[PDB]
A paper describes a structure:
The spike protein of the [name]-[name]-2 binds to human angiotensin-converting enzyme 2 (ACE2) through the receptor-binding domain (RBD) and changes the conformation to fuse the viral and cell membranes, mediating viral entry. Here, we used a structure-guided strategy to engineer an inhibitor peptide with mutation-tolerant and potent binding ability against all [name]-[name]-2 variants. We named the peptide [name] (COVID-19 eliminative Short-Peptide Inhibiting ACE2 binding). For engineering, we determined approximately 2 Å-resolution crystal structures of [name] or its intermediate-stage peptides complexed with the RBDs of several strains, including WT, Alpha, Delta, BA.2, BA.5, or XBB.1.5.
Residue numbers in the entry:
A (entry chain B): 334 to 371, 374 to 529
B (entry chain A): 1 to 39
């Protein structure tokens, strides 16, 4: 009855950031103290991962996606940028954990890996935890686009095209965001020292 | 108008990707974001 954190972090495929994946984790016990080694880079904005083993929650959500290394700093409360605004947005009062690690050897390809995309145009910023997977042509001018890309009519998603020779700031990073939900319901996700 | 220079910048981004300059295409992408974020 252990929590399936292994299927989250060590998964073969990761989603694009514009279509970020959400895995609801419930009805299990997890050892959050071992998450300092679950290569990595992690920061919890609430209590420490040690205190997480003492607490229980109704549901734990794991969000995962791939972005550039220089964009990981946007996966934090109070951030703005292309990713925060148009792709994945954390609330200002976020108290979960953000975990990211370089995935160059898995997600880069000679000639370019064009699977991973991000949204470059949007008419308004995302609300926290909003997801937008639409592919409507963005009309940048006053002339209609009639559903086809052209002058001032841009396909809203852009590919990263990851290549192994990119600088580290441009290499792909797999990111996992853990949010801890306490509802007025049985807290079915507990830690080790609970 | 902002529309002409935006189109030209966008075309440089596309051309860079077609010619294999993917990393430089990403940097031009960041310029597009910052430009449209303005007034």
């Amino acid at each position: 009855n252990l929590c399936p954190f292994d299927e989250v972090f060590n998964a073969t495929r990761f989603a694009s950031v514009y279509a970020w994946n959400r895995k609801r984790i419930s009805n299990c016990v997890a050892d959050y103290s071992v998450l300092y080694n679950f290569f990595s880079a992690f920061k919890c904005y609430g209590v420490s991962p040690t205190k997480l083993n003492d607490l229980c929650f109704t549901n734990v959500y794991a969000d995962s996606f791939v972005i550039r290394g220089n964009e990981v700093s946007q996966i934090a409360p109070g951030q703005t940028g292309n990713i925060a605004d148009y792709n994945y947005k954390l609330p200002d009062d976020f108290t979960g954990c953000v975990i990211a690690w370089n995935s160059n050897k898995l997600d880069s390809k000679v000639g370019g890996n064009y699977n991973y995309r991000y949204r470059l145009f949007r008419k308004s910023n995302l609300k926290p935890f909003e997801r937008d997977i639409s592919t409507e042509i963005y009309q940048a001018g006053n002339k209609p686009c009639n559903g086809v890309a052209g002058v001032n009519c841009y396909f809203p998603l852009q590919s990263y095209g990851f290549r192994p020779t990119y600088g580290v700031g441009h290499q792909p990073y797999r990111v996992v965001v853990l949010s801890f939900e306490l509802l007025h319901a049985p807290a079915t996700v507990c830690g080790s020292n609970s | 108008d902002k529309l002409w220079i935006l189109q030209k910048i966008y075309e440089i981004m596309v051309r860079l990707d077609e010619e294999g300059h993917g990393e430089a295409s990403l940097m031009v992408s960041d310029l597009i974001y910052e430009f449209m974020k303005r007034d």
